[PDB]
Structures are given as structure tokens and as C-alpha cells.
Amino acid sequence: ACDQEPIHIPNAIQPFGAMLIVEKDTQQIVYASANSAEYFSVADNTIHELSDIKQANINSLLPEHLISGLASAIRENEPIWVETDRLSFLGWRHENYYIIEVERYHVQTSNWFEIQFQRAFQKLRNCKTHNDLINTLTRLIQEISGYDRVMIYQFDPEWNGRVIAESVRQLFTSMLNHHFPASDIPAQARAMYSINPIRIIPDVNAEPQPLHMIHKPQNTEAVNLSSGVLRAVSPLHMQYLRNFGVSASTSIGIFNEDELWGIVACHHTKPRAIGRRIRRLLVRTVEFAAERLWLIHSRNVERYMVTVQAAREQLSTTADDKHSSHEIVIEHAADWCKLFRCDGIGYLRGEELTTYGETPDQTTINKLVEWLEENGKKSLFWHSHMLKEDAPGLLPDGSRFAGLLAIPLKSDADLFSYLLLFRVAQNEVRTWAGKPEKLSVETSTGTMLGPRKSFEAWQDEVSGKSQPWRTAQLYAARDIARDLLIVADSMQLNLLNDQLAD
Amino acid sequence: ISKLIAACDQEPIHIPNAIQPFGAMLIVEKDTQQIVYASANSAEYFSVADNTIHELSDIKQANINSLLPEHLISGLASAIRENEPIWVETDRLSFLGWRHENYYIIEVERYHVQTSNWFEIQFQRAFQKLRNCKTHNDLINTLTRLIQEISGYDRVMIYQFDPEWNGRVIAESVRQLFTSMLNHHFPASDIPAQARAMYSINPIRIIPDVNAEPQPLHMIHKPQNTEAVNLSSGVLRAVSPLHMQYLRNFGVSASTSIGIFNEDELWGIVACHHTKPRAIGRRIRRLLVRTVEFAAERLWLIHSRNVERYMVTVQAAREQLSTTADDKHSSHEIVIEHAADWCKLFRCDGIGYLRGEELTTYGETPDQTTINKLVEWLEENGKKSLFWHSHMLKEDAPGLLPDGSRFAGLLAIPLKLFSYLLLFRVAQNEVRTWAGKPEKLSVETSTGTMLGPRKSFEAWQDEVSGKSQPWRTAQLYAARDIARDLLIVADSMQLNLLNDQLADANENL
Ligand SMILES: *C/C=C1/C(=C/c2[nH]c(/C=C3[NH+]=C(/C=C4\NC(=O)C(C=C)=C4C)C(C)=C\3CCC(=O)O)c(CCC(=O)O)c2C)NC(=O)[C@H]1C
Ligand SMILES: *C/C=C1/C(=C/c2[nH]c(/C=C3[NH+]=C(/C=C4\NC(=O)C(C=C)=C4C)C(C)=C\3CCC(=O)O)c(CCC(=O)O)c2C)NC(=O)[C@H]1C
Ligand SMILES: [Cl-]
Ligand SMILES: [Cl-]
Ligand SMILES: [Cl-]
Ligand SMILES: [Cl-]
Fold it and tell me: Which of A195, A336, B265, B349 keeps 20 to 30 A from A438, CA to CA?
């Protein structure tokens, strides 16, 4: 019921600007935030109270270019940004309505943004690794935004997440490598980043301004405020931020194409106001950082394939030196352990077994081979990172092996042949920002589904599991294993030809 | 002619001791703080900065601290890394200064105050459009459309280099005034190596007026070192007269180009032309370079993901092969079942699988006799390799193929009683349109005698025959893996047959 709160239609705004909601076909103003008088009086003396906006003509409150744009815009939820000498308007269409946000603005011209943008592009282009990219991005967001704690928060497949990079200044504890549960950001909150990539909360304790009905709309249903920035903040998130020790907040979605991959999360210990040009500078910067990061990852994929091609050219050369596949394994199995990020290797053909590194004993290898022969066929390869779950009754009790990659090399033939790659359990200590308790009621606040009070480090453990096998490794190990098969088959064809000759 | 082209790289374009006239330039010594050079138009710019300036002679007496704003002086002093320009604006002047060895170089332009949200809206629209480009063709065409809309230049082109630094226009947005150059080939000599190198020092080059008289540098106070000062980091550096005449012959009054970098290698340039003079301010310059930079990372990401998608396709094929083989099909049956797919996967016209005396072919292949001449010849010369490949057999393997053979491409995977997978590519003769006939001009310059610019850029065709598309690396390894998949099935069946004949032999014995 965390994802059931209708945060798109709160009928209230944060007080760092005002909002109007107009009907498209009637041009009537049907809603105005309660603070609207103090914004539009900057342009018009006559406006002293909310009811003066009810007497007002939409053509007298809005710039002609805002109205023109809105009239001609084809796309819904595509905000038009229009400035006067004193006000910065952000308007867009949603169904029968124009939604218009307004903030206070004044012209002050410099080359600061262009200089910051050039430096950000230069630093990001010189990142060659994932680590360098992410830490550079946090430093840049912190320079540009002035917030005291800037984090990169990456989602896992369950929408749990982790802080993986961080620039944190002072007054703030370090959240780096802390885990957060999925409840901290419910699905409709994640969804908002696809509508507007930035979310700004200049002041956690600013009181929200409700939307008042001005002229009677044709349809009474709440209006979706999703594309702007003024949308009021769910009280559960406000309190979560208060518990986090946060007074202002800003997050930017990190998108891998359409996929929400992670988030730049920025916190400040005091209220802090950053304008439209800073918000856009931040979003442009995150967009360039994300492209570059996906490019680093994609290039690492090619680079790995080059590494595997090198290992196979090394293997073909040992084989040209007339060595048996048994001898190839003893020669190269340690390089393979790096290539495959595994702890041990068994190569099996018929009665013959060759091992390297951390391996179950020969008995257990034979029981795995038999089990795979009976229950693991019908697969190019069989893998597991939770071996006791996935193939019980096999390992001895208390065994430390948790991962297995198995490449079958024969089928319906005279003997069995496998390449086996083993991973020991890695018993990972996860640090959580407070115990990830499933929500019920928080008795300190008397809140149904309330957030945890404390984000202080809390450690748990998941055992009996290894790294999952990457797709790139599955195929590279199948390729390596089948290189051995070709060697062994060549030698068995020689031997068999001789014996049939006799 | 080779010598005349090589002499193009001789002109030291980094030290012309002159500037384009859309600004002014001062050069100061770092240790002595004295002004050692001033472009000849300095006084019309710095008279805005000091009322006592009325003439170039007045710079000789002037103190630097009254000519440059405090932020620029502090910034240049505190500047550690060379060739990193500092951009400082005043009310009326836009300054740009950097340090090069023992000099500060300062360019100054006239400045028009921008008070709108235009640039930020353009940045948002450009990035939105580039982020939504998911193919190579979409990216490059969207890029030229954005560069033309932002800059207003009448012709924008993406010009990609080949490994020999010739190039081709691969995308274009051109307005009614100019002739289309799409798919036209230009030779390397159009952009000498020194010229290609300048993009690494400043990614943008700006020539607002091809007929603007360049302003020489005047010595103010004597420098310790009389060598000409390197001007490469700025934008005011005067243009080679050979390239100005080139642009005149191209019918161009103004140009701006932005280098396209893939990491540290110059992969091409965005070239923009106008039929009248056209200056672009510092902000438009930055918006251009930032857009080209976001677009390139996008393009490299698109290519890199294409390799990933190609490997997914290859693995889906190899899984299909495995499904067929587990129905106890022979290798020749598998080749007949899947070779039409393999021809797409490998973009080839034909495939042959050879195993001892057996040959299976699909699509266009040489005849059996030629296939045996290939196989036998490969054993002599392809023993040292994992695969062997050529996209011009008649050069890479002279005398091998019969006279008149349609075939130009060969990818051969050895499997052993010989066994091979052979992948064949028909010659696809390729007509190239060049921008102008190759004229062998000679021109006597100051730096020596070198190639003069072409006078005509009209379409001139030539033709490359006897070649196929070149084999991509992803295809070499994919084909090798398919081939060895076929080897493994064939070996399995020979092993089965051998064990049967052996068990029968021992039974009869
Ligand atoms: C039962 C509902 C719950 C809930 C709701 C909720 N949360 C948000 C918004 C955000 N939550 C965030 C969480 C984090 N901030 C961090 O800094 C980190 C990690 C370092 C995490 C995990 C963030 C970032 C947001 C976005 C807003 C922001 O930037 O602060 C919403 C949406 C708020 C709104 O826009 O109205 C909602 C409804 N959170 C829970 O914990 C439970 C109780
Ligand atoms: C013997 C010397 C030669 C020579 C010299 C030269 N050329 C440049 C600069 C450029 N040439 C360019 C060529 C093109 N513009 C296009 O639009 C296309 C194709 C669509 C090509 C090939 C370009 C782009 C430049 C950069 C400058 C610009 O953007 O216009 C220089 C360096 C100029 C300078 O920066 O001082 C020099 C020395 N060109 C030859 O033709 C030979 C004869
Ligand atoms: Cl905004
Ligand atoms: Cl602003
Ligand atoms: Cl500039
Ligand atoms: Cl400007």
C-alpha cells in the first residue's frame, strides 16, 4: 500500500512558486494555488488576494508567448519555459488542461554555466572506468548544486538499491556501500522520473500550498501535476527525509535507455534553493555521464571477448604442440580461473579427471556428473550460484562450494565429458541504512506504513551463494570447453583408427 | 605528386604571427609580465578597456593590469596546466586567455549580452533528440539537422575519415543555395596532418569571412625568445592562404568545423559552410561543440551495442545448430538446414563445407576443382592462422582463382583428411563520386613549393573492382565457431562409426 498513494494528484504544491490550472477549450482558470496572489502581483498591482485571480483574465496573467506555445504544442506533458523580467513560467498541456507553474526570476548574465558545463564534459570524457565515471559524476553534481551529500544509488533487479559512489562534505555521515530496501522508493515514485527526470524539495519543512478551485471545471477529478516541479511531497517521504537528517533534497534519474538504472541523490542539512538553469545544468550533466557510462560498460564487453579470444589462441598453441587436453588444462587452468572468476576447474573425459584449484573431491565430482547427466541435460550449459538449493543431496554437508558452471562435452556417446567450474560461497556482509524492516505501523509517529526512524548502519549476512554466472562467462567457458573436446576427439580418432587397423 | 602533397604538412600553421580580424590578441611574457606582441587592430578593442588607448603605439606604454580584468590576471597566474583557456567577460569585451610555456596569450572579441533561455532550451532539445537516436543513420542525420538549426550555416556535413585520411560525406543538411556533397569522396590532401592535429588542441575552427584581411602581430617589448609564439589554443589564429583559396574554389565565404573524436582518435569532422560571412559568438561555439560531443558518445554507444546484438544473434544461431545436431543430423545435413541463415549472419553469397571427399555448398561458390585448389593452397599458406580471409583474392592470392571468377572475398576456417568451412563473397564493383577531378597544381608558398588547391569540386567518378565488403572481426570469430560446431558433430559420428566397427571387429575376432 506504499505504491497506492496517488502522488500524481496531491492537489497541493511546494511553496517555492505558484500554480494555475486552465481548461484548454474554455480558457477558464479552474485551479490556483493559495499563494498565487503573491506571485502574480509582481506583474500587476491590482492583485492583492486569491479572489483577484478569479476576476483575472488568463491573457492578463500570462506572457503572450506562453499562451501561444501552449496553444500550438502538439505533445502532452512537454513543458514550455518562458521568462519575463521578473517571472519564470513553466507550462504544459495535460488532457483538457494547461498547467502553469511560476517561480520568481531575474536576469543576471554570466558565463558560469557554460564554464561549468565545459569542465563537466571534459572530466566525464576522461573517465575510462566505471569507478572513475561515477565518482566524477558525484563530485560534479556537488560542485554545481552545492548540496552537501551527493550519492549514486543503483537499483538491483528487485528495486532494492545500493549507494556506490559518494561525495559528502560535512555535517553528513557517509552512506557509501549502504543498502536500501525497495520500499524507500515505491513504484509510482520511480515512475515519476520518466515524466520529469529531476525532483526538487528545496525545504522539507515548508508547508504545502493547496490548490483552490477558482472557476468550476467541467470535470471535478484531480489533475495530474506530474510534469512540473512544484508538485507537493508525500508526507511519508517528508518524514523519511526528516528521519534521514535532511532539510532539502534533489534527485535525478539515471536512465539506461527507458530503464531507470539508478539515481543521483543529493541532500543538504539546510533549506537550499537552486534555480531552473542549475536544474537543467544538472540534468544535462547526468545525461552525458550516463551515455559515457553505458559506453564504458559496452566497451568492457568487447574487451572481455578479446581476452577470451586471447585465451583460446593460447590454448590452440599448446594444442598444436601435440599436448593432450589433460595437459592443456594443467597448463592454463589458472588463467581460466581469472578469465571466469571461479576458484577451481575440473575437466572430465571418461574415467579421466583433471583438476585445478578449489574443487570438490573426485567422488562428489562423479555424483555431480551423474546428476547433470540425468537432470541437467537439455541445456548448452548448466549453472548455479546456490548449488545446495538447486541440486540438493549432492554436495557433502557443510561444503563450501556454492557455484557451479558445467559444460557437457558428450551426449548419447560411449563416455561422459564435462568442463566444470566451481565457485566457493562468498559470505557477503551487507550494511543497511537501518534495519530493512517491512512496513506495518510506526508507533513513534502513529503513521500507517511509516518510514524507519534510524538510518544507522545495520549488518546482515547472506551465505551459501557465490557471484551469479555472467552470460559472457557462460559462453566463453562453453567455447573453452569445446576447444578441449576437439583436441580429445582428435586423439581418440587417431587411437581408434589404429585399433581398427589392427 | 606524392612529394607535392607531402609538402602541404610543411606550413607551420600554428605560428602565422597574424590573426583573423574578428578579434584582437595580446601576448605577454609570464615571468617579466611585459607585453611582447599585439595584433595590429589591438587599439580599437582595448580603447574600450582604457581611454588612454588611441593607437597601437599606446600599448607599448600601457600597463597590462589596466587592459585585462582582474579575474583574467588572477586566473592566468593561478593557471597550472598549459593550453587551458580562461573565458572572462566584462560589460563590453569577451576575453579568452591561456598560458603556453612562458607566455600568456589573450584574445578579445566584442560581446553581445544574451538575456534569454534560448541556449538552455536548445541544449535540452538537442540532447532529447540525440538520446532517442538508436541507429547509426538516425544519429548522423539528426546531428547535421541540429548543427544547421543551431548555427544557421547553409550547409552542414559529417565527413568521415578512412584509414588513409581520405574521407567521405556520410550525412548532410544543405539549404537551397549550396550543391549537395552527400557521398562525395575527398582526398587526404584536403586536410594535411598538421591541420588534422589542430582539432586535438581546439575542437572548433571558425572562419567567419574568407575574404577578411588578416591582422599581423606587432612586437611591443622585446621578448627573451624571438621564436614565433604558438597560437593553436585559441580561435583567432590566422588561416593558411591555401585553405582560404580552397574555400573560395569550394564557393564558401565562411566555415566552421568541429572535430569528431572517438576517445583520442579523430574519426571525422562536422564541416559547415555559408555563402556569406557569418560570425558565431562564444556561446554558440560551446553549444556546437557540446552537441557534437554528446552525439559522438551516442554514436559510439550505438556501434558498441550493435556488436553485442550481433553476438546475441550468433549465439542464437549456434543454439539452432545445436538443436539440429541433437536430432542426430550429419554435418552436411546441418549445413543444408542452416546455410541460408549463415549467409545473412555472415553477409556472404555462398558457403561450402568440406570434409575429406565430401563437399556441401549453398549459394554462389566456386566449382569443386577450384575449391580443392583453394583448400590445397591454404595448407601451404594458411597453416599459421586461426582463419584466413581476403576481400580481394585476385591480389591477396594471385593466380589462385580462374580467369574471370566472380569471387573476391573468402573466409576459410581450417578444421583438420582435410576439413574446412569456406565463406564466399562475390565482387561488388563500387563506383565512387569524388569532389573534383584530381588536379596536379603546383604553388610556390613561403614555406616551399607544395600542392595548390583544386579549382573545381564537380562530381568525378572512378571505380574499384575485384573487391568485396571487408570481413569484420566479429564475423571471423563467429564463422570459426560455427565451423568448429560442424567439426564436433562430424567427429562425433566418425567416433561412433569407429567404435561400432571396432566392437564388431573384436566380436568377429
Ligand atoms: C509507504 C511509502 C514509503 C515511501 C514513499 C515515497 N518515497 C518517495 C520518494 C523518494 N524516496 C527516496 C529515497 C532515497 N533517498 C536517498 O537518498 C536514498 C539512498 C541514499 C534513497 C533510497 C528518494 C530519493 C525519493 C525521491 C525524492 C527525493 O529526491 O527525495 C516518494 C515520492 C515523493 C514524492 O515525490 O511525493 C514516496 C511516496 N518511502 C518509504 O520509505 C515508505 C515509507
Ligand atoms: C597543401 C595544403 C593544402 C590544404 C591546406 C589546409 N587545409 C586546412 C583546413 C581545412 N580543410 C578542410 C577541408 C574540407 N572542408 C570540407 O567541407 C570538406 C569536405 C566536405 C573538406 C575536406 C577543413 C574542414 C579544414 C578545417 C578548416 C575548416 O573548417 O574550414 C588547413 C588548416 C587551416 C587552418 O586551420 O589554418 C590547411 C593548412 N588544403 C588543400 O587542399 C591542400 C592544397
Ligand atoms: Cl525547472
Ligand atoms: Cl535560472
Ligand atoms: Cl571561444
Ligand atoms: Cl556569446
Answer: A195
Select from A292, A302, A475 the Cβ nearest to the Cβ of B297: A292
Domains: count for chain B: 3
Q: How does strand B86-89 pair with strand B93-100?
A: antiparallel
Cα maximum dimension of chain B: 119
CB atoms within 10 A of CB A207: 10
Which bound ligand lies closest to the C-alpha atom of B449? 2
Question: Please, what is the angle between helix A325-340 and helix A276-320, to 10°?
Answer: 170
Neighbours of A461 (CB within 10 A): 8
The minimum-distance atom of ligand 1 relative to the CA of A241 is 30
Strand residue runs (E) in B127-203? 155-161, 167-174, 184-186
* Residue A487: exposure state from Cβ atoms within 10 A (0-12, 13-18, ≥19): buried
- How far CA B444 is from CA of A447, B451, B452, in Å, comes to 87, 9, 8
Is the CA virtual torsion A211, A217, A219, A224 positive or negative?
A: negative
Report strand pairing: A178-180 vs A428-433: parallel
| Residue among B14, B26, B37, B29 at smallest CA distance from B224 | B29
Chain B residues whose beta carbon lies within 8 Å of the beta carbon of residue A295: 297, 300-301, 304
Same domain for A352 and A281 = no
C-beta A164 within 6 A of ligand 1: no
Residues of chain A neighbouring B120 (CB-CB closer than 8 A)? 81, 276-277, 280
Method: X-ray
Q: Could you give the CA distance from residue B287 to residue B227 in angstroms, rounded to a whole number? A: 35
By the 10 Å C-beta count (0-12 exposed, 13-18 middle, 19+ buried), A479 is classed as buried
> How far does Cα B69 stand from its chain's mean position?
40
Is the CB of residue B207 below 6 angstroms from any atom belonging to ligand 2? Answer: yes
Query: How is A166-219 classified by DSSP, letter by letter?
Result: EEE-SSS---TTEEE-GGGS-HHHHHHHHH-SEEEES-TTSPPEEEEE-S--S-
Please spell the DSSP secondary structure of B83-136, one letter per residue: T--EEEE-SSEEEEEEEETTEEEEEEEE-----SSHHHHHHHHHHHHHHT--SH
- Look at residues A105, A122, A151 and tell me which one is the last residue of a structural domain: A105
Chain center to CA of A181: 13
Let me know whether A82 and A212 are in one domain. no
Same domain for B318 and B456, yes or no, is yes
Range of the domain at B98: 17-111
Q: Which residue has the cell 520568481?
A: A104
Q: What residues contact B371, with CB distance under 8 A and at least 6 apart? A: B352, B354, B359, B365, B422
Nearest to residue B410, comparing CAs of B359, B467, B369, B486?
Answer: B467
Q: Are B445 and B242 in contact (CB under 8 A)?
A: yes
Q: Which ligand is closest in space to the CA of residue A105?
A: 4
CA B8 to centroid of ligand 2, rounded, Å: 11
* Chain B residue with Cα closest to A126: B263
Report yes or no: A383 and A406 within 8 Å, Cβ to Cβ.
Answer: yes
